[PDB]
Design a protein around this ligand. Structure first.
Ligand SMILES: Nc1nc2c(c(=O)[nH]1)N[C@@H]1C(S)=C(S)[C@@H](COP(=O)(O)O)O[C@H]1N2
Ligand SMILES: [Mo]
Ligand SMILES: [O]
Length: 262
C-alpha cells in the first residue's frame, strides 16, 4: 500500500477494469501460458530484495534497491488503457513515476539512441523458464526496448503499483514498464536491468514471431495481425466489443514522435 498524487492529466472518466481482473487475467509466460497461471503461481517470486540496474550509454550509472522503487521518485496515479495485441483491453489505474526522471538522473550520453530492458532470471521460481511448454517457447529472460525519445516520453512510466497498492507479482512486481500507446508486449515485467545502447536492441516477441510482432508495435486499428483484425477489441469490464483507437487513444500526445517517418 502506498501514497501518490493524482495529476489532472492522468485522471479521467474511463470505465475501469475491476481489480479482480487486472490482477487475475494476465499474460506472464514465466508463470505459464493461461490467463490464470500468473495469478496462481506468481507467489513464488521473491520481489524483495530487488536490484534495478541502469547501465550502458549513460554518464552516471546508478542502481535502485526495492525501497528506491517506491521512495526515490514521487509516485503518481495514472489511468491508462492497456491494449494487448491479442485484442483484449483494460483500463488500469497504475501507480509509478515517468521513466524520464530516472533516465535524467543517469544522464544519457550523446551516443545513446535506445533503451534496452530485461526481466529477472530466476528459473526455479518462474516455472515457465523451466519447461518449453509451460514457458511458451520464449527465449528467457524476457527482454524489450524503446527508442530513446519513446523512453523519454512523458507518457511512459516505471510502474510500481496498481489500484492504490504495490504490484501483485502477476503484474510484474516490483517494477514494470507501461507504454500506453503500444501493444502490451512492450510493457516488460519485473525489470532488473535498463541499459542505454547505441543500436536497436532485441525484443522478445519479435524474436519469437518476427512475422507477427515488430519493434514499434504502435496500437493501430488500420494495420492487422497475420491472424486477426486489430480494428475491434474485447474490453475487460465487469462480468464486450468496442473499436480500437489510433495509438490506443494517445494520438495527440504521441503523433509527434512518429510523424513523417517509416
Ligand atoms: N517478463 C514478461 N513480461 C511481460 C510478459 C511476459 O510474458 N513476461 N507478457 C506481457 C504481454 S503480451 C502483456 S499484453 C502484459 C500484460 O500486463 P498485465 O498482466 O499486467 O495485464 O505484460 C507484458 N509483459
Ligand atoms: Mo500482449
Ligand atoms: O500484447
Amino acid at each position: 500500500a502506498l501514497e501518490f498524487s493524482k495529476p489532472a492529466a492522468w485522471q479521467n472518466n474511463l470505465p475501469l477494469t475491476p481489480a479482480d481482473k487486472v490482477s487475475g487475467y494476465n499474460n506472464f509466460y514465466e508463470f505459464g501460458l493461461d490467463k490464470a497461471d500468473p495469478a496462481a503461481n506468481a507467489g513464488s517470486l521473491k520481489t524483495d530484495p530487488w536490484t534495478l540496474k541502469i547501465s550502458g550509454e549513460v554518464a552516471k550509472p546508478l542502481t535502485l534497491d526495492h525501497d528506491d522503487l517506491t521512495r526515490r521518485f514521487p509516485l503518481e496515479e495514472r489511468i491508462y488503457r492497456m491494449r494487448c495485441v491479442e485484442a483484449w483491453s483494460m483500463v488500469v489505474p497504475w501507480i509509478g513515476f515517468p521513466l524520464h526522471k530516472l533516465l535524467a538522473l543517469a544522464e544519457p550520453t550523446s551516443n545513446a539512441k535506445y533503451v534496452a530492458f530485461e526481466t529477472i532470471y530466476a528459473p526455479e521460481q518462474m516455472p515457465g523458464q523451466q519447461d518449453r511448454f509451460i514457458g511458451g517457447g520464449l527465449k528467457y529472460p524476457y527482454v524489450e526496448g524503446l527508442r530513446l525519445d519513446e523512453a523519454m516520453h512523458p507518457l511512459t512510466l516505471m510502474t510500481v503499483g496498481v489500484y492504490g497498492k504495490a504490484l501483485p507479482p502477476q503484474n510484474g512486481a516490483p517494477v514494470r514498464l507501461i507504454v500506453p500507446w503500444k501493444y502490451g508486449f512492450k510493457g516488460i515485467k519485473s525489470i532488473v536491468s535498463i541499459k542505454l545502447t547505441r543500436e536497436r536492441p532485441p525484443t522478445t516477441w519479435n524474436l519469437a514471431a518476427p512475422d507477427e510482432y515488430g519493434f514499434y508495435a504502435n496500437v493501430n486499428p488500420y494495420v492487422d495481425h497475420p491472424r486477426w483484425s486489430q480494428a475491434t477489441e474485447r474490453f475487460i469490464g465487469s462480468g464486450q466489443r468496442q473499436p480500437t483507437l489510433l495509438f490506443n487513444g494517445y494520438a495527440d500526445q504521441v503523433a509527434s514522435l512518429y510523424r513523417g517517418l517509416d
